[PDB]
């Protein structure tokens, strides 16, 4: 009766109920219960996962005094071109943030400051394009 090659009408006798009917719907409803239990599990993991740390909470800062870090053009005062040359040294400390103190066009470089233009780099530190590089 099996006769493995089996067209439509013959196997409908066997596949009716005998033993192979209850596994079909119990396995079909298993894959359906799981599909909505994996999209339910991923929502439950995205919700309970806490926000990751921002860049200012993740790693140390490194405060640079720009007039004393690295001089490029032999004038005796450090500048923004010399800070850029040493950026490969700063990444061997695993620094995340480079904090550069004030470099604006100043008439007094101490006593908390005296800025002549809040949108210019002081000549001794470079030019506005040295900052963009």
């Amino acid at each position: 009766r099996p006769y493995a090659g089996m067209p439509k009408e013959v196997l409908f006798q066997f596949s009716g109920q005998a033993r192979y009917r209850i596994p079909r719907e119990v396995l079909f409803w298993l894959t359906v219960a799981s599909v909505l239990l994996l999209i339910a599990a991923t929502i439950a993991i995205i919700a309970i996962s806490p926000k990751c740390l921002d860049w200012w909470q993740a790693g140390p800062m490194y405060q640079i005094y720009p007039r004393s870090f690295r001089d490029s053009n032999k004038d005796g005062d450090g500048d923004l071109k010399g800070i850029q040359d040493k950026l490969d040294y700063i990444t061997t400390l695993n620094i995340k943030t480079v904090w550069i103190t004030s470099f604006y066009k100043s008439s007094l470089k101490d006593f908390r400051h005296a800025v002549e233009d809040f949108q210019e780099i002081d000549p001794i530190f470079g030019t506005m394009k040295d900052f963009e590089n």
């Binding site: 993991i45 996962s49 806490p50 926000k51 790693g59 695993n94 620094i95």
Partner: protein, 147 residues
């Protein structure tokens, strides 16, 4: 140039600490329980829930000392591994909790395994600090904020 060739220098230790602080997941978002401290010594632990490993920093700001940690922490085994040291002589040497000595400016990062964390107890809820609490899941390998 000189300090990055020497084996035990301030620059060499600084590159070991900022690397340890970068990828540990226990230093970045672990609890901070500040155990008691007499003058001339500071002790605090960093611990997370599902990590099953705590750090213990013992920093000596005094003259010198031979301090017994088994009475103070009450959570520590009798043999702990030194994850880092300021004098750098203790690269991976293990020490005895009964008698540890600190030479006037010595700091150790002791590291051991335990299931009894200090912040879960009741006597330490007054002296543990965390910004955003988050427990760890070993099977999922994720942080989760529900615990």
């Amino acid at each position: 140039d000189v300090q990055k060739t020497q084996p035990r220098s301030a620059l060499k230790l600084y590159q070991e600490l900022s690397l340890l602080h970068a990828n540990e997941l226990l230093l970045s978002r672990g609890w901070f329980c500040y155990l008691r401290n007499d003058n001339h010594s500071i002790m605090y632990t960093r611990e997370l829930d599902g990590i099953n490993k705590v750090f213990l920093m013992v920093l000596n700001f005094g003259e010198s000392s031979l301090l017994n940690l088994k009475e103070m922490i009450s959570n520590i085994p009798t043999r702990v591994r030194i994850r880092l040291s300021t004098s750098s002589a203790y690269s991976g040497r293990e020490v005895d909790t009964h008698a540890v000595t600190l030479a006037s400016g010595e700091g150790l990062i002791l590291e051991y395994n335990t299931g009894n964390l200090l912040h879960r107890q009741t006597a330490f809820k007054d002296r543990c600090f965390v910004s955003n609490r988050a427990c760890y899941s070993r099977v999922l390998n994720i942080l989760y904020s529900l615990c």
